[PDB]
């Protein structure tokens, strides 16, 4: 029955991390027709308004959204990565990448300038392998990343497959 | 394990109709954090541009959207339902309801004038009950439908449960 196949999907979903859930949600959106996408667009808007109207999330959401699209902030995190706190900085990059807005070239470039350094550091095992794969997962399906950017990045994906 | 959990979910989904897919996707969005909602917002804005850029689905998508929000199209359809073609008109309404834009009061009014007539018709077995149950399902979680609207529609929902 439906409430039983829905409960199965909800259970496996809550067994997924935020990257995993977002990637699958992107896959499922591909199995939908226009009316459904439009309905979900309006629904995400309501959820976003609610999230920004409560202290449990409002400040946390505004700052991450701005930081993720702020070339000055990102350049400083890159500058800080080369030296240390690489792992922590990559977690921050993984949490901000989903918010990168299509058309923000200034910020996209900084992002695409760190992934190579992150890939090289996983091959020396300076940083965890799963984190860079999670970041790469987003880059492959990201609405802000062009096919041209993905070509320049394939030279780094093989090392992760 | 992950690719497998995803293949399970994906299969249960493709075994679902559009209304079940849209309602489940709505519930899963409530289990996402802000960065994920933004990614999916930008992602749909690509999949939507995708549909409106390919003959396969561009025209049909543009038309059902205008029709679902055009009081002149909707009024003319209500005037034709009363008489006949109820099942086909009800199917058209179900296909169009998800595209009702929040703030479109003129269009919303006509949708809410037809729902009573259709619940009465399902009780006299003039129309299939499944269709009306799917219409009320969208109405219960619809961003364009207010709490007031819901309370005014509660008398007709009891009969459907």
């Amino acid at each position: 029955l439906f409430c039983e196949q829905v409960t199965t999907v909800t259970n496996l979903f809550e067994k997924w991390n935020d990257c995993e859930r977002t990637v699958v949600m992107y896959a499922l959106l591909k199995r939908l027709r226009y009316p459904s996408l439009k309905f979900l667009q309006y629904s995400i808007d309501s959820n976003l308004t609610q999230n920004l109207g409560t202290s449990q999330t409002n400040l946390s959401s505004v700052v991450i959204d701005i930081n993720a699209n702020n070339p000055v902030y990102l350049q400083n995190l890159l500058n800080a990565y080369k030296t240390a706190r690489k792992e922590d900085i990559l977690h921050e990059v993984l949490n901000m990448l989903p918010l990168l807005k299509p058309g923000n070239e200034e910020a996209k470039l900084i992002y695409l300038t760190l992934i190579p350094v992150a890939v090289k550091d996983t091959m020396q095992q300076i940083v965890p392998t799963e984190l860079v794969q999670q970041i790469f997962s987003y880059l492959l399906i990201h609405p802000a990343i062009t096919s041209e950017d993905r070509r320049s990045l394939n030279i780094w994906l093989r090392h992760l497959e | 394990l992950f690719c497998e959990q995803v293949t399970t979910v994906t299969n249960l989904f493709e075994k679902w109709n559009d209304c079940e897919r849209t309602v489940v996707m709505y519930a899963l969005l409530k289990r996402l954090r802000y960065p994920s909602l933004k990614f999916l917002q930008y992602s749909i804005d690509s999949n939507l541009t995708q549909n409106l850029g390919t003959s396969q689905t561009n025209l049909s998508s543009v038309v059902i959207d205008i029709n679902a929000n055009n009081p002149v199209y909707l009024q003319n359809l209500l005037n034709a339902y009363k008489t006949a073609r109820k099942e086909d008109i009800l199917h058209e309404v179900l296909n169009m309801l998800p595209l009702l834009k929040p703030g479109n009061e003129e269009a919303k009014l006509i949708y809410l004038t037809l729902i009573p007539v259709a619940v009465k018709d399902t009780m006299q077995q003039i129309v299939p009950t499944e269709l009306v149950q799917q219409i009320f399902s969208y109405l219960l979680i619809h961003p364009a439908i207010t709490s007031e609207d819901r309370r005014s529609l509660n008398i007709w929902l009891r009969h459907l449960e």
């Binding site: 990637v23 896959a27 790469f136 492959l140 399906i141 497959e161 | 690719c3």
Partner: peptide, 14 residues
Amino acid sequence: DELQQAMRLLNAAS
């Protein structure tokens, strides 16, 4: 497909 490529990386990372 790039989405398939992404699920493989996400597979490995679990």
